[PDB]
Every structure is written in structure tokens, then in C-alpha cells.
């Protein structure tokens, strides 16, 4: 594997601090990142522009990973939704590509967020995972105003080996997640 600044920071700075804060007896007991899952809820592409490969390609640019499609589990009259319609894009980031994406996210993406004043301390899984939602995709460094047809937001799942909210918070905090409270 390769050297990424955030990854190294996890092993030499974050891991020792966590043992200090919580006192694990086993080197595996200590929290890890499992995977990061990104989802473009979409469905604006249910009928109109029935294929938005644009969102896939631009999502592919940010992660380095081509997203797979998600199709409607059931038909829903009110949402003008027929079962099996392509209504989302999901990409699962693991290992290096997870670190690289989290690294730019913390370093440049979140700061680019409009009127950004920290993340939500309350958005923790209860089971030691975290989720955050973005409304603009131009927030990422490799996406610009020139290349975009329309604003698309996303949902981000950060999944940790931590059992509890308290442990996962310390991890994400120590890694560089900026929280409002």
C-alpha cells in the first residue's frame, strides 16, 4: 500500500492517544475505520434525463471509484416511481481510497461548505458510526462550477469498529473531524 498523510496520522498520532484516553488491552480493541459509503439519493433522474452518467462520472472523479446504481425496491405512486427505476448512486470506499477521500474531505471539502461552522455532534449512529449530508458536489476540490449541469448532494457513511458513540467520536475528532459542539 501507499503513504497518505491522514493514514499515517491515524497510526502514529491517533492510535496512541486512543489507548491513553480509553485504555485498551488489545491492539484490535482500539477503533478503526472500516469503510466510507457515499450515496447520491438522486431520483431527480427517475423520469427526466432518465440517465445521469454525469453524476457518476463526477462522483468517480472525487473518489477515484466508479459508483454503482441503486434501483427502486418498490413502485410508489406519489413519488412517480416505478419499481426498478434507477434512482441512486452508491460507492463503497475502503482502505487507501477511503483515507485519500477522507483526507481531502477534512482538509479542503468541509472548509468549502457554505457558512460552515462545524459538524453535528448529534449525528452519531449510537453504535459508533457517523453520517453527514452534503447539498453541493462542487465542495470537492476536483469538481468546479464550469463542469456542472446542476447541484447534487450526497449522504456519507463513516463506519468504525468502535462499539460506542464516545469511542467513535474521539477517533473522528482525533483524525480531524470539526464538530460544532
Amino acid at each position: 500500500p501507499l503513504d497518505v498523510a491522514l493514514k499515517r496520522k491515524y497510526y502514529e498520532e491517533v492510535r496512541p492517544e486512543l489507548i491513553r484516553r480509553f485504555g485498551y488491552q488489545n491492539v484490535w480493541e482500539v477503533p478503526r475505520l472500516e469503510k466510507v459509503v457515499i450515496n447520491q439519493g438522486l431520483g431527480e433522474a427517475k423520469e427526466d434525463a432518465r440517465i445521469l452518467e454525469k453524476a457518476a462520472q463526477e462522483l468517480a472523479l472525487i473518489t477515484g471509484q466508479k459508483p454503482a446504481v441503486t434501483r427502486a425496491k418498490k413502485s410508489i405512486s406519489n413519488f412517480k416511481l416505478r419499481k426498478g427505476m434507477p434512482i441512486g448512486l452508491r460507492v463503497t470506499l475502503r482502505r487507501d481510497r477511503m483515507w485519500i477521500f477522507l483526507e481531502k474531505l477534512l482538509n479542503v471539502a468541509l472548509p468549502r461548505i457554505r457558512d460552515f461552522r462545524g459538524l453535528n455532534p448529534n449525528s452519531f449512529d449510537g453504535r459508533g458510526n457517523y453520517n453527514l449530508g452534503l447539498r453541493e458536489q462542487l465542495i470537492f476540490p476536483e469538481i468546479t462550477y464550469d463542469m456542472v449541469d446542476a447541484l447534487r448532494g450526497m449522504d456519507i457513511a463513516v463506519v468504525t469498529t468502535a462499539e460506542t458513540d464516545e469511542e467513535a467520536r474521539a477517533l473522528l475528532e482525533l483524525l480531524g473531524f470539526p464538530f460544532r459542539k
Binding site: 498523510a5 477515484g64 481531502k104 482538509n107 479542503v108 472548509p111 468549502r112 460552515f116 476540490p141 476536483e142
Partner: protein, 69 residues
């Protein structure tokens, strides 16, 4: 990883307005950014910008105790 469908991640350098430089990996070799972690007001100390005000009001008004005694 699957051949043909993914975009290559290469060594890349992201540059901020504050002169900050970030060594990372991207689809683009060089990228220039308006803001970053190193200089963002919320991140840097508490760089309270233009607003020290809190808020002020109302009876910072003073000016003064001139009405007589």
C-alpha cells in the same frame, strides 16, 4: 479493482490561497483552492473575523450618564 472503468488516482498537490500546500492523491495533478483547513476561521483558533460584536447592544449604548442627577 476493475479494469477500464475507474479514473486513475495519481500523486497530486492541492494549493490554497493562504499559501497552504497539501500533498495527497487525486484524479487531477494540481488543484488550486480558495480555502482550506489551515486558514478557515472556524478551524484557526477562533479567528472571529469582522464580528467581535456580541452583539453589542443594548446598553453598551451609554453615551452617556449625562441626563442629570
Amino acid at each position: 479493482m476493475k479494469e477500464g472503468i475507474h479514473p486513475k488516482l495519481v500523486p497530486a498537490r492541492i494549493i490554497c490561497g493562504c499559501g497552504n500546500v497539501i500533498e495527497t492523491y487525486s484524479t487531477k495533478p494540481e488543484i488550486y483552492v480558495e480555502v482550506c483547513s489551515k486558514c478557515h476561521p472556524f478551524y484557526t483558533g477562533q479567528q472571529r473575523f469582522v464580528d467581535t460584536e456580541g452583539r453589542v447592544e443594548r446598553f453598551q449604548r451609554r453615551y452617556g450618564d449625562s441626563y442629570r442627577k
